[PDB]
Design a protein around this motif. Structure first.
Motif, PDB file in Angstrom:
ATOM      1  N   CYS A   1      -4.601   1.677  -7.713  1.00  0.00           N
ATOM      2  CA  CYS A   1      -3.928   0.860  -6.715  1.00  0.00           C
ATOM      3  C   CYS A   1      -2.648   0.321  -7.334  1.00  0.00           C
ATOM      4  CB  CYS A   1      -4.816  -0.293  -6.231  1.00  0.00           C
ATOM      5  SG  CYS A   1      -4.190  -1.145  -4.763  1.00  0.00           S
TER       6      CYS A   1
ATOM      7  N   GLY B   1      -9.813   0.910  -7.153  1.00  0.00           N
ATOM      8  CA  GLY B   1      -8.930   1.223  -6.041  1.00  0.00           C
ATOM      9  C   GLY B   1      -9.630   1.145  -4.698  1.00  0.00           C
ATOM     10  N   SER B   2     -10.868   1.640  -4.629  1.00  0.00           N
ATOM     11  CA  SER B   2     -11.607   1.597  -3.372  1.00  0.00           C
ATOM     12  C   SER B   2     -11.891   0.167  -2.935  1.00  0.00           C
ATOM     13  CB  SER B   2     -12.917   2.375  -3.508  1.00  0.00           C
ATOM     14  OG  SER B   2     -12.682   3.772  -3.526  1.00  0.00           O
TER      15      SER B   2
ATOM     16  N   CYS C   1      -9.885  -2.551  -3.813  1.00  0.00           N
ATOM     17  CA  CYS C   1      -8.691  -3.334  -4.089  1.00  0.00           C
ATOM     18  C   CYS C   1      -7.561  -2.895  -3.170  1.00  0.00           C
ATOM     19  CB  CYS C   1      -8.252  -3.195  -5.554  1.00  0.00           C
ATOM     20  SG  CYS C   1      -6.673  -3.985  -5.935  1.00  0.00           S
ATOM     21  N   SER C   2      -6.652  -3.830  -2.900  1.00  0.00           N
ATOM     22  CA  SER C   2      -5.445  -3.557  -2.135  1.00  0.00           C
ATOM     23  C   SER C   2      -4.328  -4.414  -2.705  1.00  0.00           C
ATOM     24  CB  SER C   2      -5.641  -3.852  -0.644  1.00  0.00           C
ATOM     25  OG  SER C   2      -4.562  -3.340   0.121  1.00  0.00           O
TER      26      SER C   2
ATOM     27  N   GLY D   1     -10.437  -1.582   0.389  1.00  0.00           N
ATOM     28  CA  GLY D   1      -9.387  -0.592   0.274  1.00  0.00           C
ATOM     29  C   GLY D   1      -9.490   0.574   1.228  1.00  0.00           C
TER      30      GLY D   1
END
Ligand SMILES: [Zn+2]
Lengths: 189, 100, 315, 248
Positions: free
Chosen positions: A109, A135-136, A138-139, A158
């Motif tokens: 991310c 990443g999955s 998190c944003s 995410g």
RNA sequence: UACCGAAGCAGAAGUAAUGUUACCGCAAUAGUAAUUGAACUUAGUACGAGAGGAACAGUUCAUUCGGAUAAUUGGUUUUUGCGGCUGUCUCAGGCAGCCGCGAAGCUACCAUCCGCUGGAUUAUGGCUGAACCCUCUAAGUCAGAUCCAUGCUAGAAGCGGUGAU
RNA sequence: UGUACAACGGGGUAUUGUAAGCGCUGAGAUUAAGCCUUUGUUGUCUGAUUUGU
């Protein structure tokens, strides 16, 4: 500012969508309202590119990048890469990354100033020109980032929502408290 | 499309041909026909087998970003392909003549 | 069991009064199958623009020449052949079709009829006027130019093709002018046109409809087997020729699927007998790459030009 | 036969069914559950009441007594939200259980409005539910003080009294006060066209084809940028290979 | 399972040898079917206090079955094929032997291509209109699925035209 | 009695991994027993026998 849409009755909109400050990626489909909602809010300020990755429906997991450039997975077809290069403006760079797992967004991310994941880390830093430290879950963007503690309590932050410096998108399952949290964390107000 | 080179014999893999089972281990399996696939499965050492380029090239038998694809760029490739093919063919012929 | 090596067309499409006089069907010889990949431009599909891979049959379609015209009277007991008329000439292979012992027979083909055509034409013009005033449904008599197809058959298969134009006076006028002429394959079918296929299996005859022509092969120009993308100087014929078939050196047609009948079997094509409204028929079949690897065995190369690339060079 | 009883439910509801319907009758109906003689006996062996109550509950509002709840005096429920209430001024028009849903501070709230059986139904709906009791009227002493006199026996409901209320601001203020007090107390038919939707150095080749294969090999490998210099270098290399004596 | 009617049915969701030979042809006739389910838009819209969520139309798929195919993947191989190896003695690894690879083949839901469109009607929905004001019924009459047509397979050990003496 | 038929010749096309022997040598070898073509060579072409306005 915020937007709400359903991807062919699907609640997770971030899976088939990706937003940045200079370009937008959306999976191809036959829903006029889905693309119309994105176009109306974004207008023609940035190119809303109808594209896919390796022929797969999902594009949010596969694609990760910032306004400076976009990173594509290894499995992406050459035709798709050429189409993305044509659709993306000259000011935006594109770089291919060799990774075992095609889901770049699952662990990566980034925004216009910071990134996260050393061969791949340095490549991301150089291409995106940002510092590099989920990443999955998190944003990130220039308005801060949100991580797991959207879409009626969905833990995959995410995947259910995507947002940029000036536009936020969430699934129809998103509730008012979730919308307020998204607005506060991203300082929209 | 993407014509891969068979890692067992450095041979072309044209569309629609070859077998590539997508194993969970996430590895490329590039082959041109069942012969190469079974040889790889049999673990026949390509670096020490006579009929594969991997060994021939060393034994002395034989010698990340996209492109916008503008009209001028492709126009150069037309002559470049022919020049490179001619150079490679001449080099291979010279190597074979020396081997003889 | 089938009646003969060739199959009979049991129906024809509805006539069109406004359209010009044109043929309705064509026939050719099976030439095996080949692999092809194309972009799936079908809307509303999860594989939109994807490179779908499927097999397409190849049929050899040598030029077909008109040899006669036949009108039929709509009698209360079905259509009756009012009068058949041949045009001044019969080809060697056309005559051969009328003999079981052609070599032994004296080859006494049309002689007085050919001499009759040498007359002032009044009889032929009388029959043409008869057809003009009388029966208003007309079928053309044609044959396959097997002398060009590289097959040991050496026998031309006679067939009848019904005209779909209006003003049967115009039909007979067209026949009067296009007698003993050669009709190209592209004049009856075009790319993206939906057609049906009828043939005899390896021995019953069956009909399959809704088959799209992937490519119309103009065998006069090179690179007929190369698409706009591949565009290589390669013919549809792979290296070494064809499996149990001689060679392709004339017009050919590529059809989605597999037409019934083994290789070298004669097959016929027709325009679906109706105007299909399916979006699949309307969409154009853009072509990306056509397989040309040697079918005999397991070909690791497409053409001899690139064959040496893998080996570099050979003794 | 038993399927009928399965769909019939059996603390507010116990008394609610005793005023909109008959509790004793409902319970009695539920609990009253060669072959010519047997067939006649079975045929010989009030059922419309069960069907009537089933139909009535099929469209009646569904509410939980533990959930938050709260001249033209009867127009408050109609004005607060998208709910319909009879405009007749007489009191007995409120036989049905009128409910109106709305959202306050991201939390669901709803207003409810409602001796004769109707009076007993209203009394039970007020006492058994957690809803507060409110007294709204438009601007006699005995008539106004009737609610206050009867206040003590239901004062546990956190009574609130607001009097002039057709003005919308008053309704908004009442709703805001009550909500806080409750807690305090066409389609795809053609191929997608991408033309003119992508950027390029110039529009001369906007209708690009990109064959991607030439001379049996992929163009992507040979598509280097402005490599005319590389072509010149390759020509020089060929010249050096031919004239140096490698192929004399 | 399809079409209608009742039903507080808001929404969601009763009917069924021939003058010979050869070629090109017509068709009385016998058989006949595709099948079951899914996803997308109008679709977050009509409906509704809210849970809930349509539809006529247009698209994309999947299971079974029917007609074909082996371009290629597999079951696969008398190409007993190429190379290797062990008894057999004077390099052939011979042959009644084994192994790695193996075209060609029969063949697979074990893979690929395709698998209907026009009318009359039961119930039903209606018009005009008497017996007897009304009424779809008495005389007329529109829409509408079971039937008939279209296509497909064979062609009476029935028929038409054409060439040769 | 002629680019017609068949057998040879070359070529292309498949299996192969470097036979025996002295780098030859992805050569040779089965080479179609269910492959094709072509540019050269050779032979082929005559009986039995039935019907016809
Ligand atoms: Zn290989």
């Amino acid at each position: 500012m915020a937007t709400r849409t359903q991807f062919e009755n699907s609640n997770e909109i971030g899976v088939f969508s990706k937003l940045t400050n200079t370009y937008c990626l959306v999976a191809v489909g036959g829903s006029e309202n889905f693309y119309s909602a994105f176009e109306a809010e974004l207008g023609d300020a940035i190119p809303i590119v109808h594209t896919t990755i390796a022929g797969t429906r999902i594009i949010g997991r596969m694609t990760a990048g910032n306004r400076r450039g976009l990173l594509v997975p290894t499995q992406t077809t050459d035709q798709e890469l050429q189409h993305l290069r044509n659709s993306l403006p000259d000011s935006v760079k594109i770089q291919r990354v060799e990774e075992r797992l095609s889901a770049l967004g699952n662990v990566i991310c980034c925004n216009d100033y910071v990134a996260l994941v050393r061969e791949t880390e340095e490549l991301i830093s150089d291409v995106l020109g940002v510092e590099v430290f989920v990443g999955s879950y998190c944003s990130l963007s220039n308005q801060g980032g949100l991580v797991h503690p959207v879409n009626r309590g969905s833990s995959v932050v995410g995947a259910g929502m995507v947002v940029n410096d000036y536009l936020a998108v969430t699934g129809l399952d998103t509730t008012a408290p979730e919308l307020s949290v998204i607005e506060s964390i991203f300082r929209l107000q | 499309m993407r014509i891969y080179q068979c890692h067992f014999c450095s041979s072309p893999c044209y569309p629609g041909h070859g077998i590539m089972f997508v194993r969970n281990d996430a590895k490329e399996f590039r082959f041109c026909r069942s012969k190469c696939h079974k040889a790889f499965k049999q673990r026949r050492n390509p670096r020490k087998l006579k009929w594969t380029k991997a060994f021939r090239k060393a034994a002395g038998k034989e010698l990340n970003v996209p492109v916008r694809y503008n009209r001028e760029l492709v126009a150069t490739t037309l002559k470049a392909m022919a020049r490179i093919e001619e150079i490679r063919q001449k080099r291979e012929r010279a190597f074979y003549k020396n081997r003889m | 069991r089938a009646a003969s090596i060739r199959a009979r067309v049991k129906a024809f499409p509805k006539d069109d009064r406004s359209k010009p006089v044109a043929l309705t069907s064509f026939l050719g010889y099976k030439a095996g199958m080949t692999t092809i990949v194309r972009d799936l431009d079908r809307p509303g599909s999860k594989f939109h623009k994807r490179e779908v891979v499927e097999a397409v049959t190849v049929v050899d379609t040598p030029p077909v020449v008109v040899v006669g015209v036949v009108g039929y009277v709509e009698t209360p007991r079905g259509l009756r052949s009012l009068t058949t008329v041949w045009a001044e000439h019969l080809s060697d292979e056309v005559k051969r079709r009328f003999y079981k012992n052609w070599y032994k027979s004296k080859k006494k083909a049309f002689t007085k009829y050919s001499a009759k055509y040498a007359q002032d034409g009044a009889g032929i013009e009388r029959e043409l006027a008869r057809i003009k005033k009388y029966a208003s449904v007309v079928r053309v008599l044609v044959h396959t130019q097997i002398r060009k197809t590289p097959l040991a058959q050496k026998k031309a298969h006679l067939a009848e093709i019904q005209l779909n134009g209006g003003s049967i006076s115009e039909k007979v006028d067209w026949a009067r002018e296009h007698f003993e002429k050669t009709v190209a394959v592209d004049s009856v079918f075009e790319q993206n046109e939906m057609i049906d296929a009828i043939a005899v299996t390896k021995y019953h005859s069956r009909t399959s409809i809704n088959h799209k022509i992937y490519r119309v092969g103009k065998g006069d120009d090179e690179a007929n087997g190369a698409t706009s993308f591949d565009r290589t100087k390669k013919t549809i014929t792979p290296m070494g020729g064809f499996v149990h078939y001689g060679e392709i050196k004339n017009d050919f047609i590529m059809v989605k699927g597999c037409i019934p009948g083994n290789r070298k079997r004669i097959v016929t094509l027709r325009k679906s007998l109706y105007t299909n409204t399916s979006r699949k028929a309307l969409e154009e079949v853009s072509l990306k790459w056509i397989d040309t690897a040697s079918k005999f065995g397991k070909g690791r190369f497409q053409t001899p030009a690139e064959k040496h690339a893998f080996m570099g060079t050979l003794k | 036969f038993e399927d009928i009883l399965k769909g019939f439910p059996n603390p507010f509801h116990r008394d609610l069914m005793d005023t909109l319907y008959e509790k004793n009758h409902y319970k009695i109906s539920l609990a009253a559950i060669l072959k010519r003689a047997a067939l006649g006996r079975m045929a010989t062996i009030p059922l419309a009441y069960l069907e009537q109550v089933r139909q009535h509950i099929g469209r009646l509002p569904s509410i939980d007594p533990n959930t938050r709840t709260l001249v033209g005096k009867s127009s408050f429920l109609r004005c607060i939200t998208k709910s319909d209430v009879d405009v007749q001024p007489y009191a007995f028009t409120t036989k049905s259980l009128y409910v109106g849903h709305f959202d306050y501070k991201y939390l669901r709230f709803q207003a409810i409005d409602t001796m004769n059986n109707i009076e007993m139904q209203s009394i039970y709906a007020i006492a058994h539910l957690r809803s507060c009791v409110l007294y709204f009227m438009d601007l006699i002493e005995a008539q106004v003080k009737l609610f206050h006199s009867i206040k003590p026996l239901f004062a546990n409901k956190s009574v609130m009294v607001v009097i002039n209320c057709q003005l919308e601001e008053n309704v908004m203020e009442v709703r805001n006060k009550a909500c806080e007090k409750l807690l305090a107390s066409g389609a795809g038919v053609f191929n997608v066209n991408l033309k003119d939707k992508y950027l390029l150095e110039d529009d001369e080749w906007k209708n690009d084809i990109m064959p991607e294969i030439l001379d049996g090999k992929n163009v992507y490998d040979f598509l280097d940028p402005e490599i005319a210099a590389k072509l010149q270098a390759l020509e020089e290399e060929e010249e050096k290979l031919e004239n140096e004596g490698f192929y004399n």
